[PDB]
Design a binder for these strands. Structure first.
Ligand SMILES: [Ca+2]
Ligand SMILES: [Ca+2]
Length: 258
DNA sequence: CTGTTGCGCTTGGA
DNA sequence: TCCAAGCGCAACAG
């Protein structure tokens, strides 16, 4: 099951287990957290698979002062634990300034990454997490360090796609007939009896990607932005104390019965 | 509109 | 199992 299906299974669970007081937000919506408890004390619940990533921030190398600068276009403010990650990479500037796709691990105490995550998700009014070990686990942001091991790497992450627009429709068809694919287009919708799912087409300084949806084909334009970001990874601890499990469930049931 | 960027998401290949 | 890596989305500037 993919991560989209997993979010749906968590919302479905909460609604049947506790009542339909849980609203699911957009899947790939960067602005907010996953599930909004629409009760008398609203808060957010964050869904994460057993192996997930856990937030990020962009750092721009500044080769003049040989330090890393927090990008002003970031969406989360600096907390103390951010500055401690920056200071480490800055004092190791020579090795971290050569940005990589495979990334370079940050070998800092796990204490730092856990506190950054707690601060970051508190900043989104997340009070509880939900995940699964075969059975659904719900725990408050305060006890995060008892459920996940945390890793941290600094890597280039190319920015996301955008829909094919009218301006670049003459250019897309240019690249299509150079590859030999026959097609017809009703507006921006693509139609073909050849299967070109996830075919990548390129030419004249845009890169195109073809996707199949609703019995037809959608075209996406790929990005040109290759900034590096500190990014956190989490993995569910395999044997968890049943002592903390029951207390944290009681904490959730208390928080929604309020 | 058109293009850039940062955050969402584990995913896919070895 | 372990390691490498970017597209789907909204905000923002223009
Ligand atoms: Ca989300
Ligand atoms: Ca989530």
């Amino acid at each position: 099951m993919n991560w989209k299906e997993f979010e749906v299974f968590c919302v479905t669970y909460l609604n049947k287990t506790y009542g339909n007081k849980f609203a699911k937000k957009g899947e790939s919506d960067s602005t907010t957290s996953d599930i909004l408890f629409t009760g008398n004390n609203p808060f957010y619940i964050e869904a994460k698979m057993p192996h997930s990533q856990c937030g990020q921030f962009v750092l721009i190398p500044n080769r003049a002062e040989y330090k890393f600068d927090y990008s002003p276009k970031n969406k989360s403010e600096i907390n103390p634990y951010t500055q401690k990650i920056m200071q480490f990479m800055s004092e190791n500037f020579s090795e971290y300034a050569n940005l990589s796709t495979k990334g370079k691990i940050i070998p800092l105490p796990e204490s730092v990454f856990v506190n950054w995550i707690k601060e970051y998700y508190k900043s989104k009014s997340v009070k509880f997490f939900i995940t699964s070990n075969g059975d659904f686990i719900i725990f408050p942001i305060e006890h995060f360090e008892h459920y996940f091991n945390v890793s941290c790497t600094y890597r280039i992450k190319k920015s996301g796609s955008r829909h094919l627009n009218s301006k670049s429709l003459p250019d897309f068809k240019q690249a299509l007939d150079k590859k030999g694919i026959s097609y017809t287009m009703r507006g921006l919708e693509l139609h073909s009896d050849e299967n070109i799912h996830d075919k990548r087409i390129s030419g004249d300084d845009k890169d195109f990607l073809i996707k199949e949806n609703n019995g037809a084909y959608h075209v996406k334009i790929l990005s040109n932005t290759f900034n590096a970001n500190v990014i956190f990874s989490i993995s569910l601890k395999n044997n968890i104390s049943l002592f903390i499990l029951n207390e944290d469930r009681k904490a959730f049931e208390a928080a929604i019965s309020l």
